[PDB]
Design an enzyme around this catalytic site. Structure first.
Site, PDB file in Angstrom:
ATOM      1  N   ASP A  35       5.845   4.698 -10.341  1.00  0.00           N
ATOM      2  CA  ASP A  35       5.055   4.125  -8.895  1.00  0.00           C
ATOM      3  C   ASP A  35       5.679   3.793  -8.128  1.00  0.00           C
ATOM      4  O   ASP A  35       5.731   2.936  -8.437  1.00  0.00           O
ATOM      5  CB  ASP A  35       3.720   4.119  -9.297  1.00  0.00           C
ATOM      6  CG  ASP A  35       2.554   4.108  -8.076  1.00  0.00           C
ATOM      7  OD1 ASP A  35       3.463   4.619  -7.247  1.00  0.00           O
ATOM      8  OD2 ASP A  35       2.242   3.594  -7.917  1.00  0.00           O
ATOM      9  N   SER A  69      12.056  12.406   7.354  1.00  0.00           N
ATOM     10  CA  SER A  69      12.564  13.671   7.052  1.00  0.00           C
ATOM     11  C   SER A  69      13.065  14.727   8.822  1.00  0.00           C
ATOM     12  O   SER A  69      12.323  14.052   9.594  1.00  0.00           O
ATOM     13  CB  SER A  69      11.454  14.177   6.246  1.00  0.00           C
ATOM     14  OG  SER A  69      11.787  15.907   6.147  1.00  0.00           O
TER      15      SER A  69
END
Length: 330
Positions: free
Chosen positions: A35, A199
């Site tokens: 994770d 992004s």
């Protein structure tokens, strides 16, 4: 040193991925959910409330000659999906794919929430976010990667998650045969303890690319891709019959649909998520309505590039003095 381990989807929908981890002496192998959105290595154990164990493999520290109770140390974690767990702490030897750390904090669960109990395939979590998020008190503990970093050939790990297939976590090296083209690297903020990046935009299907900054986290422990409502609405508008369902808790779509791809930007580079990666199957057994793999982050407070996005790429988690993230197509 290096390590390399295969990671396998837990079910036919790629709901999560498990990676075998050796703990203790002699080794006890548990299948953990790696994770990158959390920083605790915790396991089902012989100390876990019996009614909360249903098929998981347990760590039994009393059978490990290298286990040592970390006196006074406890842990307690809650995840974004509402699940939680807590317990005590041992130090022990932990190996992943041939890479060994001695003295790793292994957080042994005394309690787990119902979602963990109900998932027989996941024996615990191995956190790969920054150690500032580790929940052990009163002395915070280091992640497996932070403990291994100095010994690694290069201070990196890579995630290569498969679609309906096994994949690989590598530590300490970049397998240049595992991707196509080049790896584009992008800046990371560690201020919230995550692999947080920006992004450069998105496209839906064959549509034009929209240049727009989308801050979010690279999180292998989250299944889906959570993005701003405007982006998610634009995606599902291209799917006949798709709608946001308050009762189901997200966008749903007809199981008969063929879904469009979704592209996200990494600098000037582009990662294309095939449409099939966005289908998470019937909302309930036998339904002809299917759950979408791209969902709104409104009300989460953060955008999450979970497995749906990451599995479309070869992802470098560069843990150098100034961390960065790399993405390549594959």
């Amino acid at each position: 040193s290096t390590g390399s381990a295969t990671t396998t989807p837990i079910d036919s929908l790629d709901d999560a991925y498990i990676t075998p981890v050796q703990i203790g002496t002699p080794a006890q192998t548990l299948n953990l959910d790696f994770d990158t959105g959390s920083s605790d290595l915790w396991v089902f154990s012989s100390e876990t409330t019996a009614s909360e164990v249903d098929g998981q493999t347990i760590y039994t520290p009393s059978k490990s000659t290298t286990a040592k109770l970390l006196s006074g140390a406890t842990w307690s974690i809650s995840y974004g999906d509402g699940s939680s767990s807590s317990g005590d702490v041992y130090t022990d030897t932990v190996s992943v794919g041939g890479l060994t750390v001695t003295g790793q904090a292994v957080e042994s669960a005394k309690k787990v929430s119902s979602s963990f109990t109900e998932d027989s395939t996941i024996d615990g979590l191995l956190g790969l976010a920054f150690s500032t998020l580790n929940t052990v008190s009163p002395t915070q503990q280091k992640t497996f990667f932070d403990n291994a970093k100095a010994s690694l050939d290069s201070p990196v790990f890579t995630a290569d998650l498969g679609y309906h297939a096994p994949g690989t976590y590598n530590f300490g090296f970049i397998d240049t045969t595992a991707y196509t083209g080049s790896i584009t690297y992008t800046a990371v903020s560690t201020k919230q303890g995550f692999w947080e990046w920006t992004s450069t935009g998105y496209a839906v299907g064959s549509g034009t690319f929209k240049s727009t900054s989308i801050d979010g986290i690279a999180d292998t422990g989250t299944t889906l891709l959570y993005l701003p409502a405007t982006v998610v609405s634009a995606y599902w508008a291209q799917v006949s019959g798709a709608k946001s369902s308050s009762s189901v808790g997200g966008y749903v779509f007809p199981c008969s649909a063929t879904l469009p791809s979704f592209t996200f930007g990494v600098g000037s580079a582009r990662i294309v998520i095939p449409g099939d990666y966005i289908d998470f199957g019937p909302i309930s057994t036998g339904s002809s309505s299917c759950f979408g793999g791209i969902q709104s982050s409104a009300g989460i407070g953060i955008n999450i590039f979970g497995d749906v996005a990451l599995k479309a790429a070869f992802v470098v988690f560069n843990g150098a003095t100034t961390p960065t993230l790399g993405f390549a197509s594959k």
